[PDB]
């Protein structure tokens, strides 16, 4: 068991999209009659005129290899660029924003570390739209620090440090490579402010328990070992 996000919200959205595609197929929508391996949930634009970010069930065969980028979701409900792009003329998808949004809300309650939630809230309050990671900055692929990252600048396929549900080291999808592209500048380093936000969270365990983090809330709280 790795100290890493299980990406449980994304898994649930993909499974719900597979069911929705199957239902549309039964309604006669031929292009939705596919195996489950062809269907994922992505938060993205759609065809021409569908210019807002919405949750949609996409046939992966209709997605472009690169980008109109598509976004996946972390277990605190934040959308982050994932591999691929929308073909604005040829996309094969079903927009299902309400049900998929509701599933994200339900998932956040289950899976989002209160420590990470606090760090994310600090970042969004100070720099709207940003989320917290301890990851790379611009043109340096070694150094990590707690920063408020513009979500568009993160890579879902790259895991980066985040806060567990015990306020301990954890890794989450949505990270930086430390490259030197323009996107690599889109962050605000906030070591003191993020650390304070994390330290302000009340423990799920008593002062007489050891917190062992888990990929779902709550963590394990074990009775501290006695002076045996």
Ligand X SMILES: CC(=O)N[C@@H]1[C@@H](O[C@@H]2O[C@H](CO)[C@H](O)[C@H](O[C@]3(C(=O)O)C[C@H](O)[C@@H](NC(C)=O)[C@H]([C@H](O)[C@H](O)CO)O3)[C@H]2O)[C@H](O)[C@@H](CO)O[C@H]1O
Residues that bind Cl ion (CB under 5 A): 5, 74-75, 172
Closest by CA position to 44, among listed 16, 85, 77, 11? 85
Please say whether the beta carbons of 76 and 116 come within 8 A. yes
Size of the site for ligand X (CB under 6 A): 7
Which 166-225 residues touch ligand X, going by CB under 6 A?
185-189
Interaction residues for ligand X, span 86-125 (CB under 6 A): none
Q: Which residue is nearest to ligand X (CB)?
A: 189
Across-strand partners of 224?
Answer: none
Q: Which two tokens stand for residue 64?
A: 């472009």
Residue 172 site contact among ligand X, Cl ion, none (CB < 5 to 8 Å, cut-off depends on kind):
Cl ion
- Residue whose C-beta lies closest to Cl ion: 5
Query: Cα 211 to the chain's mean position, in Å?
Result: 24
Out of ligand X, Cl ion, none, what residue 137 binds, judged by CB under 5 to 8 A for its kind, is ligand X
* 137 contacts ligand X (rule: CB under 6 A): yes
Q: How far is the CB of 141 from ligand X (least distance, A)?
A: 15
Q: How far is the CB of 129 from ligand X (least distance, A)?
A: 12
CB 162 within 8 A of CB 175: no
Alpha helices in 74-113 (DSSP H): 97-111
Q: Measured from the CB atom, is 83 or 85 closer to Cl ion?
A: 83
Whether residue 175 contacts residue 141, with contact meaning beta carbons closer than 8 Å, is answered with: no
User: What is the token pair recorded at 94?
Assistant: 């079903």
Residues within the interface to ligand X (CB under 6 A): 137-138, 185-189
């Amino acid at each position: 068991h790795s100290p890493a996000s299980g990406r449980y919200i994304q898994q649930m959205l993909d499974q719900r999209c597979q069911e929705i595609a199957a239902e549309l197929c039964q309604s006669g929508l031929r292009k939705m009659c596919v195996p489950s391996s062809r269907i994922v949930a992505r938060n993205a634009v759609g065809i021409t005129h569908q210019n807002t970010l919405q949750w949609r069930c996409f046939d992966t065969a209709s997605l472009l290899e690169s980008n109109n980028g598509v976004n996946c979701v972390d277990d605190c409900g934040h959308t982050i660029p994932c591999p691929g792009g929308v073909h604005r003329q040829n996309s094969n998808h079903a927009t299902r924003h309400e049900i998929l949004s509701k599933l994200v809300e339900e998932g956040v309650q289950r899976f989002c570390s209160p420590y990470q939630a606090s760090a994310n809230k600090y970042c969004n309050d100070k720099f709207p739209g940003t989320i917290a990671r301890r990851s790379k900055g611009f043109g340096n692929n070694v150094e990590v620090a707690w920063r408020c990252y513009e979500k568009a600048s993160l890579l879902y396929s790259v895991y980066a440090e985040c806060a567990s549900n015990c306020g301990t080291t954890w890794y989450c999808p949505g990270g930086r490579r430390g490259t030197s592209t323009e996107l690599d500048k889109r962050h605000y380093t906030e070591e003191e402010g993020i650390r304070q936000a994390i330290g302000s969270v009340d423990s799920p365990c008593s002062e007489v328990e050891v917190c062992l983090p888990k990929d779902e809330n709550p963590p394990l709280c074990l009775d501290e070992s006695g002076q045996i």
